[PDB]
Amino acid sequence: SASAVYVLDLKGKVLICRNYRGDVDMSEVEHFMPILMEKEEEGMLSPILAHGGVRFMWIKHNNLYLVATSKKNACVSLVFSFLYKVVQVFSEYFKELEEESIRDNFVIIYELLDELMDFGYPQTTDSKILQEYITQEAPRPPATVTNAVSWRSEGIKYRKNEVFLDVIEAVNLLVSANGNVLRSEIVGSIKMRVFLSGMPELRLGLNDKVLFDNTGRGKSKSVELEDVKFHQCVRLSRFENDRTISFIPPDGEFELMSYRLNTHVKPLIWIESVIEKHSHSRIEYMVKAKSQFKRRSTANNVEIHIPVPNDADSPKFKTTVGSVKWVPENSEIVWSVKSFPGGKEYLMRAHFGLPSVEAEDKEGKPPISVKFEIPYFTTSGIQVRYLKIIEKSGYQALPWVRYITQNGDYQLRTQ
């Protein structure tokens, strides 16, 4: 129940404002900046502000804060969802999200803001559907918005029918300083770029553990996805009935399903790091990286970030494989490895100086995070079984998909 959706800037100036109900004065935005400054300086800053009887709930963008004022007991989750949809629409329409496009795309920005939400209740949020009625370079609105299918425009024709899938894995490991992993969860991400003719009804089929158990084949390798979040095109009733994933793919790239299940296996990359930091004399980084993944998979662009001292200077890196560089901007040693074959072992021996004068305040111990990304390797073992592409006209589709394994929240707690 947002009262006025406005876009701020880094200097407190409102780049664009669009009131939806008018129950909140437009002058309340001026007090948002002092309130945010006071909250930040006292540690009480939150995404949802409160200027007396009006709450300023907004998120932080790349360069401006999309603060949406409200007065009644409006849904905070609804406001956040509307802000996220607006950000996604802006990203789809404008390749950059900064002040350069706010002051240059006002003619289309105002129209998009007016069409997106009326009276604080959003009605249209599909970028592809919205691009057929509001353009910066007007006909009647498309029937897709009025029709039930609001995520697949009818009449789309292509020379070929090729759909590219992307099974992107997110290996997140929360390893404590004691050497044990606390939070080790893998979140799947099935992002497909559907490019077909017409409005095909894709029938996604995978080797799900529940599906295998229901069919009676609960004995082979099946992915045990604890949480499965289907897209808007995916029919919730069909999935709830008999695990049938049937939905109409959209035109372009979109996220169909987002699996998320816990992982009880050993980490793909094991980092054994030591800190022989002398008392204001020197420091040693005996960091060893052990690859527990399969030898047939190579972790391309492996970047194990080792947090070095903030005031360390004149550092020396004695590694074996991969270039090691220290970035003073990040205050850490980036153990960058181009190709990391499975089962390999890279040993590094850091050595950096330290000023004689001790630091005035503590700096903390940021966790060490690795940036391993091994393509063609599915840690969860989930494999796509079938993709039922059915069209009324009748055509031979050529679906495609690739499996990519990377590191998500794979941080290692320091000592």
Binding site: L165, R203, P375, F377, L387, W400, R402
Partner: peptide
């Protein structure tokens, strides 16, 4: 070629489950 694993063709349905 493509970084992150070469794209592989997908099936149409579970042919072994009828």
């Amino acid at each position: 070629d493509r970084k992150g694993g070469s794209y592989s063709q997908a099936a149409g349905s579970d042919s072994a489950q009828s």
